[PDB]
From a paper:
We screened a set of n = 6 recombinant larval proteins for immunomodulatory properties and identified an enzymatically active T. suis chitinase that interfered with recruitment of immune cells and inflammatory reactions in a murine model of allergic airway disease. Since mammalian host chitinases, both true chitinases with enzymatic activity (AMCase and chitotriosidase) and chitinase-like protein (CLP) molecules which can bind to chitin but lack enzymatic activity, are implicated as either mediators or biomarkers involved in airway inflammation and fibrosis, disease amelioration by treating with a worm chitinase was rather surprising.
Our data indicate that the structural similarities between the parasite and host chitinase contribute to the disease-ameliorating effect of the helminth-derived chitinase on allergic lung inflammation. Our findings further reveal that T. suis chitinase treatment of allergic mice not only inhibited host AMCase expression on mRNA level but also interfered with host chitinase activity in the BAL fluid, suggesting an alternative mechanism that might involve the high degree of structural similarity between host and nematode chitinases.
Author numbering: 32 to 399
The structure:
C-alpha cells in the first residue's frame, strides 16, 4: 500500500570516525527499496561503477542484506547533483546514443544483480523534455524486451524528480512519463539553503504566511499537489524525507528567526565537513551542547540555534507529521535521503534511548 525507500551513498564510506557508513549498517525491513547512489555515466555514454570498490565490495555488500530481508529490492541510481547535465543532455539527443547507454545499462544491471534503475537527471530542461520522454520510453521498452526474452520479472524503473514546479513544467511530460515510470521520487527538499541571504526552511510540510509569492508552492504539500495535477497518479508520487539539515551563519546572533539575516553558510560540521549542511546525528551532538530547538508549527519543521549558527532540519516530530500526512493524503509512500545521515549507530543521540535509525524507522512504523 505504501512505498518505503532509502538512498545508500557510496561515498559515506569516507566519513571520519563513527560517521563512516557501511552496508552492514543497514537494518532489516527499514526499507522496501534501497536506491544505490550512484553509478558513473562515462563521457562516451556507457555505464560503469563510480567508486573503485562498488563492483567488488559495496554492490555485493548491499545485496547480502537480502539474506535477512528477502524482498528487499535494490536499484542503481545514476546522476545526482554533482553529475550535472552535460553528459545527460548529449546522451539523450539521438536514438543511437540512448541505445548505447540503455544497452550498456541493461548489461551492468544484470552483471551486478540489481533489481532496477533510478534515473536522477537533475534536471531536464526545455531542450531536453522530448529527449527525456524518449529516453524513459526506450528504457522501459528494453526492460520489457529483456524480461520476455529472458523469462524474468521486468527490471524496476524509477526517477528522482524535481520538486520545483517551474522545472517540472520545463522538462517533464508528466502524463506520458506516468505511463512509463514505476514511480517518481519527489525531491521535495533543498527548497532553502545557504545560497540564500536569510534563514528559511529546508523541507517545509506546508507553506508559511510569511513566504513570498515565488515560494508559495515550495513546500512538500503543494509540490506533490503540482505533480498530481500535471497527471502523475498520487500513488506514483513518493515523498522525499531529508535526514540532513541546512544552516547559515547568522548576521546578528540576536535576530534568530526564520528569515533572520545571514552573512554566509553554517560552519562545516565535524563529520559531513560540508559547510551549510548538517547530518541529523550531528544535530543531536549540537543539542547535547546546549543548542536550542524551536518548533515551527506552520511548516511543521524544527530549527536549531546555537551561537551565530542556525539550521533548518528534520527530527522525529517533523517526520511523524510528514509521514502521517502521506497516509492522510494517500500519496504512494516515502523515501529517505540518506541512510548515513540518520543516527544509524543509535549512539549520537540520547533522546531516543539508543534506538537505531530514530528517523528512518518512522517509515516502517507508520507506513507498515
Amino acid at each position: 500500500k505504501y512505498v518505503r525507500g532509502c538512498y545508500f551513498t557510496n561515498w559515506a564510506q569516507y566519513r571520519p570516525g563513527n560517521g563512516k557508513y557501511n552496508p552492514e549498517h543497514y537494518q532489516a525491513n527499514l526499507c522496501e527499496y534501497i536506491f544505490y547512489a550512484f553509478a558513473k555515466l562515462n563521457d562516451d555514454f556507457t555505464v560503469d561503477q563510480f567508486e573503485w570498490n562498488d563492483i567488488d565490495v559495496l554492490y555485493p555488500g548491499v545485496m547480502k542484506q537480502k539474506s535477512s530481508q528477502p524482498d528487499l529490492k535494490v536499484l542503481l541510481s545514476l546522476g545526482g547533483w554533482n553529475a550535472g547535465t552535460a553528459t545527460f543532455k548529449k546522451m539523450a539527443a539521438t536514438y543511437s546514443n540512448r541505445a548505447k547507454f540503455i544497452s550498456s545499462l541493461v548489461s551492468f544491471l544484470q552483471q551486478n544483480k540489481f533489481d532496477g534503475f533510478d534515473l536522477d537527471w537533475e534536471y531536464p530542461e526545455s531542450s531536453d523534455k522530448e529527449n527525456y520522454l524518449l529516453l524513459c520510453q526506450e528504457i522501459l521498452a528494453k526492460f520489457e524486451e529483456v524480461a520476455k526474452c529472458t523469462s524474468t520479472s521486468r527490471l524496476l524503473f524509477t526517477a528522482a524528480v524535481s520538486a520545483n514546479p517551474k522545472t517540472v513544467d520545463a522538462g517533464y511530460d508528466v502524463p506520458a512519463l506516468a505511463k512509463v515510470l514505476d514511480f517518481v521520487n519527489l525531491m521535495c527538499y533543498d527548497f532553502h539553503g545557504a545560497w540564500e541571504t536569510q534563514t528559511g526552511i529546508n523541507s517545509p510540510l506546508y507553506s508559511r504566511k510569511e513566504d513570498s509569492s515565488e515560494f508559495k508552492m515550495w513546500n512538500v504539500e503543494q509540490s506533490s499537489k503540482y505533480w498530481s495535477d500535471k497527471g502523475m497518479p498520487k500513488k506514483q508520487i513518493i515523498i522525499g524525507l531529508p535526514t540532513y539539515g541546512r544552516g547559515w551563519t547568522l548576521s546578528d546572533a540576536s535576530k534568530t528567526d526564520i528569515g533572520a539575516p545571514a552573512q554566509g553558510s553554517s560552519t562545516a560540521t565535524e563529520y559531513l565537513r560540508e559547510a551549510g549542511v548538517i547530518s541529523y546525528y550531528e544535530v543531536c551532538q549540537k543539542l547535547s551542547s546546549g543548542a536550542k530547538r524551536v518548533w515551527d508549527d506552520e511548516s511543521k519543521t524544527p530549527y536549531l540555534v546555537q551561537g551565530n549558527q542556525w539550521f533548518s532540519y528534520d527530527d522525529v516530530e517533523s517526520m511523524k507529521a510528514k509521514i502521517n500526512w502521506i497516509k492522510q493524503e494517500n500519496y504512494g509512500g516515502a523515501f529517505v535521503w540518506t541512510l548515513d545521515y540518520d543516527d544509524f549507530l543509535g549512539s549520537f543521540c540520547t533522546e531516543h534511548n539508543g534506538k537505531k535509525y530514530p528517523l528512518i524507522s518512522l517509515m516502517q512504523e507508520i507506513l507498515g
